């Protein structure tokens, strides 16, 4: 298996950026992350370490190698993960527990539905519930046991409101500690992206659900890379480069690639693969990775475009019609 690819959605100011940064900080402290372009990997060992206080209540053993978190949240990035469903394997829908569902919360729901991306809800800012007294970094189930009873009562009223919106939207959901069948109900996991409370359940649910239910998508197949472009930018000493996510196979230096551009399909060859310095050049990257790709002729590449490596010029040519067809469905 390779790493699930996780995207973070939700309304402005509900804590997406904060949550991703808390996760990364928690992982860096456990050991910590792997450095990818536009993404961070939490290794399975680190997830097992962070989930250690839950070991007696739930099985915490991982058969995924890690989780890859896309570091840019929100709807434009999610649109750039679409492919003939999504490249994303799982999403976190961040809702500020005090505020509830806002307009971009419902947009994210529609996008998730349309692309059939499975998800959970992170009911964030629980530290802002009147009376909350933090236990930093603790599992939700440990810290809530130490809050005033009125605190639990407010939390359950806010969660019930979320559950009401979700049902109205066609999607059964519940507090994660009130679910028997995680295939049938969307889990609501209360967290604080400020204090870290609930991050352990957060990570254990993501890991649990992806490795249990998505093993067919997560199968690594040795083969030429398949990916998506997330950004197009100018890079001094390399011209226009693309930041991509590789979701299957292996991408190597000097591989031929086919990518979509504004004046038609681009056929080029990898000149350098760049990763963050611990930029450094690497000879190859395996799925799942975020990598920066320097190749000639990428000026007109369309963000969101598929990227397909090719063993030969003749197989490249055969890919160009698929790429154009993909690009058309994405406009």
């Amino acid at each position: 298996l390779r790493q699930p690819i996780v995207v973070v959605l939700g309304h402005v100011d509900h804590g997406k950026t904060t949550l991703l940064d808390k996760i990364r900080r928690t992982a860096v402290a456990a050991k910590g992350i792997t450095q990818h372009i536009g993404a961070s990997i939490v290794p399975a060992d680190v997830i097992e370490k962070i989930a250690e206080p839950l070991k007696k209540v739930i099985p915490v053993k991982l058969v995924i190698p890690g989780l890859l978190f896309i570091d840019t949240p929100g709807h434009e990035l999610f649109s750039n993960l679409r492919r003939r469903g999504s490249v994303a394997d799982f999403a976190i829908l961040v809702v500020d527990i005090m505020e509830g569902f806002k307009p971009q919360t419902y947009e994210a729901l529609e996008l998730l539905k349309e692309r059939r991306v499975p998800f959970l809800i992170a009911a964030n800012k629980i530290d802002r519930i009147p009376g909350w007294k933090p236990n930093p970094d603790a599992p939700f189930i440990e810290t809530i046991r130490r809050q005033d009873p009125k605190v639990r009562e407010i939390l359950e009223q806010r969660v019930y409101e979320i559950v009401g919106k979700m049902y109205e939207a066609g999607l059964p959901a519940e507090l994660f500690t009130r679910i028997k069948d995680f295939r049938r109900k969307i889990a609501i996991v209360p967290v604080s992206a400020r204090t870290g409370e609930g991050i352990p359940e957060l990570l254990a649910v993501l890991a649990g659900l992806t490795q249990t239910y998505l093993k067919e998508r997560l199968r690594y197949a040795e083969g030429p890379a398949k990916g998506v472009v997330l950004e197009v930018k100018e890079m001094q000493g390399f011209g226009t480069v693309v930041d991509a996510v590789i979701y299957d196979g292996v991408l190597k230096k000097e591989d031929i690639i086919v990518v979509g551009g504004r004046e038609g399909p681009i056929v080029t060859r990898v000149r350098a693969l760049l990763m963050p310095a611990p930029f450094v050049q690497v000879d190859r990257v395996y799925a799942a990775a975020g990598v920066r790709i320097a190749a000639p002729g990428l000026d007109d590449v369309i963000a969101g475009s598929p990227i397909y490596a090719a063993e030969s010029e003749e197989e490249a040519r055969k890919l160009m019609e698929a790429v154009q067809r993909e690009i058309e469905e994405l406009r």
């Binding site: 099985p59 679910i179 995680f182 254990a204």
Partner: peptide, 11 residues
């Protein structure tokens, strides 16, 4: 429950 996460049920 094949995930085993319903070990949390009741908390």
């Amino acid at each position: 429950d094949l995930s085993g996460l319903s070990g949390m049920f009741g908390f």
